[model samples]
Target: PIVIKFSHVVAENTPKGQGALLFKKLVEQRLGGRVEVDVYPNSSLFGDGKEMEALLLGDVQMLAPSLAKFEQYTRKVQIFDLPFLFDDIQAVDRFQRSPQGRALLTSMQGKGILGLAYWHNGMKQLSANRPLLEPEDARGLKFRVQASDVLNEQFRQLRAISRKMSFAEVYQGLQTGVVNGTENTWSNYESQKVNEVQKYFTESNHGLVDYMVITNAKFWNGLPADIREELQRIMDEVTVQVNLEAERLNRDARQRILASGASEIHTLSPQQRADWRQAMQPVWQKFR
Candidate 1:
């Protein structure tokens, strides 16, 4: 039997986490005794910044890292991290399914990382100790961001400081004031319980947090044809389930955050949102 190790950095109840487990169940049951899938969630097997390296070394077989994390392989990966690129998650859906977007799945093939599918995590919201309804409100504030140049620039454009930190360290970063706040989807804020530490939440929906399920290209291509084909088929099914659940989970998570009153949630008015768009749009030009 072949052992396929799937490592991820989110909790088991999150959409991606659920997707990983579903893939394992389908592979083990349908692939028969020829395969065994071991899934390690919440960065148990490998944390952020390390999982990609592990996958490249073939120490791990699969991952669904945020697109922003792929900036090292190709600058194109940062496109997803650009602020205000899509109007909504539906726009993101249309693009990821288009020919140009699908081409990105193979964008890192040359680097030995092959993207098998795109997974949704929903749009991002801004959070801090104070209300952030306008771009000016973020000025001088420190924000935690992923290790991507575009993400750093996005904060800089708002005149807000950004610290590149790993996912696991985020909660501690917030609690200890390593950073004042961060941007993320409701599901992530809720799942990681970051809401419990932060006092403010802004429904900016200015950006997104999405993933591309990836594997070592050579390892994937070299798998026995039957096993490879079966795995891909199962992954395709799992992707659908995951994306469908993404929006629902985010909605439910937002409600949970509200009910818990862990943080005060604020929505940007039309003018306020426009102001934010104007303030951050320059970040897009630099990368363009």
Candidate 2:
């Protein structure tokens, strides 16, 4: 029997969190004790700042960090971070299943990372202490964004400042005024308690929050052929479930957030959404 460690930085109820557990359950059921899966969620095993290094160093066997984290390893994935590139989560799904997008899964293999699948979390929504109905509302505000050049520039174009901080620090960042705003999925806002600290939320749906399921290349390629095949098969199954469950959880989170009255959720009208895309065009062109 061999031990396989799976670790991630989000709460267990997240798409990635439940996805990890599903993979473990399927592996245990089908492999018949030949492999053991240990799942560490919510940074219990490793924080986001260190999980990638842990995986590369073989301290952990698996992770599904947001696609933003892969930029230093592969530039192709940065395209996904481009503002307003995909119309919706379904559009993103279509592209990820396309030949070119699927090509990205294996692109990082030579870099000591092997992408197994893309798990959808949800679209990113903007939040701040003030009402955010238009691009001008964000001007002069500070946003806590993921460590991506495209994301940083996205905020820059809106005349907002972008701060790169750990996901674990965002709640505090907002509370302490280190950042006046941030973008995140509904599930993350609820689970991370971002809903409590922020006063407003705009359903901009301008960008996405997705993850690439990956493992350390050395550990993955070194596994027995039978074990590797089964693991990959199980991963494929879990990816679908994760995506399906993503919509439900995000909707539930939206409901819970609304019910709490902790923050106001704004859905961008068609005209407002177009205005946002127009403002974000340069950020997309800069990378294209």
RMSD (CA, Å), each prediction: 0.8, 1.0
Candidate 1 lDDT by residue in tens digits, 12-77: 888899999999999989986898989999999999989999999989999999988888888877
Q: Could you give me the TM-score of model 2 versus the true structure?
A: 0.98
Clashing pairs in 1: none
Model 1 residue 183 CA deviation in Å: 0.2
Q: Model 2: runs farther than 4 Å from truth?
A: none
What would the TM-scores of all predictions be? Answer: 0.98, 0.98
Clashes of each: 0, 0
For model 2, name the residue pairs that clash: none
Angstrom error of the Cα, residue 71, model 2: value is 1.6
Lowest-scoring 10 consecutive residues by lDDT in candidate 1? 261-270
